[PDB]
Amino acid sequence: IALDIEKAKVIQSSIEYTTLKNVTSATEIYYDPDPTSTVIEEDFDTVEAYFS
Amino acid sequence: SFRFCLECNNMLYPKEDKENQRLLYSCRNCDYTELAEDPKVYRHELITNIGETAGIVDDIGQDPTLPRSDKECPECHSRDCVFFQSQQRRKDTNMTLFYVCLNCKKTFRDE
Amino acid sequence: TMKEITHAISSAKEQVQEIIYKAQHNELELKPGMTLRESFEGEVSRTLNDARDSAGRSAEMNLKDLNNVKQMVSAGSKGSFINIAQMSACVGQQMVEGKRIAFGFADRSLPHF
Ligand SMILES: [Zn+2]
Numbered sequence: 001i002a003l004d005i006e007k008a009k010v011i012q013s014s015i016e017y018t019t020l021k022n023v024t025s026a027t028e029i030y031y032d033p034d035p036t037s038t039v040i041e042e043d044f045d046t047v048e049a050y051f052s
Numbered sequence: 053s054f055r056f057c058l059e060c061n062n063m064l065y066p067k068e069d070k071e072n073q074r075l076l077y078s079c080r081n082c083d084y085t086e087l088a089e090d091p092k093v094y095r096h097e098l099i100t101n102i103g104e105t106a107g108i109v110d111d112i113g114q115d116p117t118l119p120r121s122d123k124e125c126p127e128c129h130s131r132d133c134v135f136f137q138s139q140q141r142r143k144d145t146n147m148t149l150f151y152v153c154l155n156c157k158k159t160f161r162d163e
Numbered sequence: 164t165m166k167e168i169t170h171a172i173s174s175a176k177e178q179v180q181e182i183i184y185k186a187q188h189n190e191l192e193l194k195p196g197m198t199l200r201e202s203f204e205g206e207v208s209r210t211l212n213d214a215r216d217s218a219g220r221s222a223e224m225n226l227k228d229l230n231n232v233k234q235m236v237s238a239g240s241k242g243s244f245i246n247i248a249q250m251s252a253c254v255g256q257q258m259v260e261g262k263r264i265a266f267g268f269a270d271r272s273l274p275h276f
Pocket residue numbers: 057058059060061062079080081082083084
């Protein structure tokens with residue numbers, strides 16, 4: 001690992017601390033009274049694909 | 053953005069009906085209740101870019117301490133302009149320039 | 164030698180101008196563990212330090228053996244290379260708290276800029 005850069009980078013990634021807040025960009029709260037469907041149109045396709 | 057009560061000017065907190073399954077903005081100081089238009093109750097930006105270009109005034113061309121360039125205006129193609137960096141002053145802030153024309157007074161970049 | 168020193172300082176200032184343009188067009192490489200502003204400041208400071216060292220080295224190579232400052236520096240009794248550089252070629256960059264002169268006014272160092 002000391003003479004190889006890729007394995008060293010793998011070890012570095014495995015050591016460094018990473019929280020959810022680091023990768024998160026924005027969080028939102030929405031009102032949706034239908035458990036099996038949704039009001040948002042952008043995500044409607046993906047969630048209906050999941051449920052089906 | 054949050055709305056205010058139309059009768060006693062207090063804040064309209066969101067409320068949910070168990071029987072009707074609707075989102076309603078209701079004032080806790082009275083019985084007033086108005087139907088909500090959007091379900092976006094709350095939004096938090098961990099990384100934000102607001103205030104970077106929001107610090108702009110319409111009289112910034114009268115400041116004598118600002119540098120003057122000859123960059124081309126995208127709208128009226130003037131030959132004089134005034135530039136400055138980002139008004140946000142965090143440690144992560146970029147060093148990109150904002151140019152202001154002396155005729156249309158709009159803010160535009162160089163990219 | 165004065166022509167050579169002036170050429171070195173002018174070339175360094177042109178290099179600093181190029182670094183400024185690159186940082187103002189998002190074309191600057193970020194040193195790991197440091198922000199864009201910190202990397203830009205460090206790179207400009209390194210360029211200016213190299214400029215002063217090059218000008219001083221030119222000035223110190225110019226000196227004859229009969230030069231008295233050279234004789235004192237070579238004896239090791241008083242003075243060093245930086246003294247010759249600052250006396251003859253260039254004083255260099257002034258650092259306050261390990262950084263260049265800050266913007267004590269509103270976004271400038273003096274009301275003459
Ligand atoms: Zn009310």
